Design a protein around this ligand. Sequence first.
Ligand SMILES: Cc1onc(-c2ccccc2)c1C(=O)O
Ligand SMILES: Cc1onc(-c2ccccc2)c1C(=O)O
Lengths: 268, 269
Amino acid sequence: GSLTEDGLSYKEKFVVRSYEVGSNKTATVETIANLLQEVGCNHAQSVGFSTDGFATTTTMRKLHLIWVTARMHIEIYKYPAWGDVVEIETWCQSEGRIGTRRDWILKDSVTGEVTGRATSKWVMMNQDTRRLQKVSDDVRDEYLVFCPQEPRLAFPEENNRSLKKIPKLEDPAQYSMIGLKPRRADLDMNQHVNNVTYIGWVLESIPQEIVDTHELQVITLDYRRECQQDDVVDSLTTTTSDSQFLHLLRLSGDGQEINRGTTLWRKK
Amino acid sequence: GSLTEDGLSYKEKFVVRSYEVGSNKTATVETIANLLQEVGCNHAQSVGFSTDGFATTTTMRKLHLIWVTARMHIEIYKYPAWGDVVEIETWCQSEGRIGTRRDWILKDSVTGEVTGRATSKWVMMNQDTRRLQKVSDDVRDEYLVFCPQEPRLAFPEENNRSLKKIPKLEDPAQYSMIGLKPRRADLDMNQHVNNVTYIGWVLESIPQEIVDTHELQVITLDYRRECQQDDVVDSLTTTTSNDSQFLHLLRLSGDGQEINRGTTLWRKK
Ligand SMILES: Cc1onc(-c2ccccc2)c1C(=O)O
Ligand SMILES: Cc1onc(-c2ccccc2)c1C(=O)O
């Protein structure tokens, strides 16, 4: 992996692994999501950020501030096959005082064609109180030297899927997977549940026949609250329609919302 | 990755990834186990085997036969850090009519030192009936051309941990993790539960304080029966012992049907 000539984006190639593929012998959406995390971390390392947190500036570390994912949006046209090489380019951009945005472009290494794209919204939070906050001049001036100054959007089109408001699923759900718990493999280096686990939990309530006859094209996921190591989750899905689904992840007990999302699937 | 000069073993280098590391910023035992299965599959591909089943010979495919893991034994001296390069060499050997054995050696790419080793026992089974069987001459002659003829063992020692009989844990267990279920990420390309998931399930019943103050040095795991996609598992652990040893049992949450038994050895950080 390496920063591009202008030092304003990062590229990395990955060979798809045997355990990373599903029933169609292509990478799962959770494998893709893991690769977006990996290329994101390597981009931050290559521009001076030191491994404690993700892209934590000097001012942020002193004020106990972290970047937290609020929304992840992934669109896949072709899932790479087992043994294929996929090249991912990533970059970040300031969104004024709201927060930051990280975008990715996935390409087939042999053909050079775009096989997928992703966009994500990140907000500033205090590590200890978990209270959100706007981005100050001091932190903006520290990370702006690593971003392209003109807009560079993975999803440029007006009125696109990445910017649509997601409603709250109403009971009763059409489908559900109850009693989902994280294991140690689901935790990151800071003992928090890996954000990719929530994508898997959302997909658990999709019926197996849809998974067997369709391919996931679009996933939009909002992160409202974290699931602790000793929390239990219920995954709910209702068809809203290609097949479209509305999703809700909530705590098995009190029904406290942790995530809401939408998926779009194409007939194979 | 590539076969060595003699074509009798395979090597591959891996850069440790951010999501593959635990609290100590080093690769977890499940990341290591995933890398053993990746280097194993690339070795089989490099010597002519198809992507259908793992190392299924021409005669095996015709008779609906597959290689299935009966035991996995892993010993780690140093877990590679996030961003470090680890080199893994793997090879196969015939164990007469019993089955085959696959061994691995893990090395630090920068120093060349052995940081871990693994050995595994594989048996022949019919895909459909699940009935075990001995290795015929026809099958042996097909895979023997890919194996070193003289013995090559990752665990040579006279009385070593990889060949010890594992007892069945007696109720009540000291520790337990109940109601463990596989999700889609836990399934392989043939929709069976990935063998690495069972290692994670075994480790789930180890208390967090042991995990926090100790490092896993040795894991020996026996595979008795497969966990289906709609099965629910209970993980049981009892301390048997500076080092801490544990006896493990994985069984179906309902009828208590045994799926795995194992042992772990941990050392104080
Ligand atoms: C870095 C990084 O880059 N992408 C993600 C991410 C966020 C949400 C869902 C999936 C991946 C991520 C993380 O810290 O989890
Ligand atoms: C190939 C391959 O090489 N190693 C394994 C394996 C088996 C048991 C536990 C961990 C990995 C394995 C598999 O098919 O699961």
